Design a protein around this ligand. Structure first.
Ligand SMILES: Nc1nc2c(ncn2[C@@H]2O[C@@H]3COP(=O)(O)O[C@H]4[C@@H](O)[C@H](n5cnc6c(=O)[nH]c(N)nc65)O[C@@H]4COP(=O)(O)O[C@H]3[C@H]2O)c(=O)[nH]1
Ligand SMILES: Nc1nc2c(ncn2[C@@H]2O[C@@H]3COP(=O)(O)O[C@H]4[C@@H](O)[C@H](n5cnc6c(=O)[nH]c(N)nc65)O[C@@H]4COP(=O)(O)O[C@H]3[C@H]2O)c(=O)[nH]1
Ligand SMILES: [Zn+2]
Ligand SMILES: [Zn+2]
Lengths: 76, 75
């Protein structure tokens, strides 16, 4: 199970619900020195942290992220 | 940057290097990247390796540099 973000989709989700996630992906892009990408693969541990950021169980944050098309179905 | 020279690592006496070798090998397994000649690893892995080796992170680092496994920019 890789955790792949589609950042093109992510840039189309409105801000005050995608904001924390968008800032999270952006920092990961930054520290890697990779701003180029279609798509961002993130750590299993990032999902956990993001859940905390978003007041959700990893399971339902995943579900939310999958409905934006930000994560793919395979993410379960 | 914690970059391991795997090729130098393979030639270090296993008394010294086996644990780090197996560590590095596992990480390669997990990336499915079995063909690199260098491996950089997480900052976090240094703490774990310290425990594995029973030394300070900073001693371990000094040790790995002297084997020529780590380059000195990691000091
Ligand atoms: N302790 C340790 N474990 C390692 C290391 N390299 C790979 N792994 C482990 O093996 C899994 C697979 O890594 P991957 O194939 O590159 O799959 C990774 C990789 O594609 C990318 N990723 C995560 N962290 C980084 C990073 O710091 N830099 C880059 N360029 N990609 C990362 O996102 C993927 C998912 O990451 P994970 O959920 O963590 O799942 C990681 C991770 O648990 C390492 O250097 N140290
Ligand atoms: N293929 C692969 N390589 C790995 C992985 N984990 C660590 N590394 C490699 O080893 C470098 C050091 O990772 P770091 O200490 O965690 O230092 C990392 C880490 O602190 C952070 N970072 C990069 N990607 C991620 C990510 O996906 N999630 C999180 N939470 N932090 C990341 O930014 C720093 C810089 O990462 P890099 O520039 O890529 O530099 C990373 C990357 O080259 C992995 O799972 N797969
Ligand atoms: Zn657009
Ligand atoms: Zn608005």
């Amino acid at each position: 199970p890789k955790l792949v973000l589609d950042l093109e989709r992510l840039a189309h989700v409105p801000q005050e619900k995608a904001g924390p996630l968008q800032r999270y992906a952006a920092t990961i892009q930054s520290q890697r020195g990779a701003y180029n990408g279609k798509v961002l693969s993130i750590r299993q541990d990032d999902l956990r942290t993001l859940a905390v950021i978003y007041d959700q169980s990893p399971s339902v944050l995943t579900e939310q992220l999958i409905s934006w098309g930000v994560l793919d179905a395979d993410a379960r």
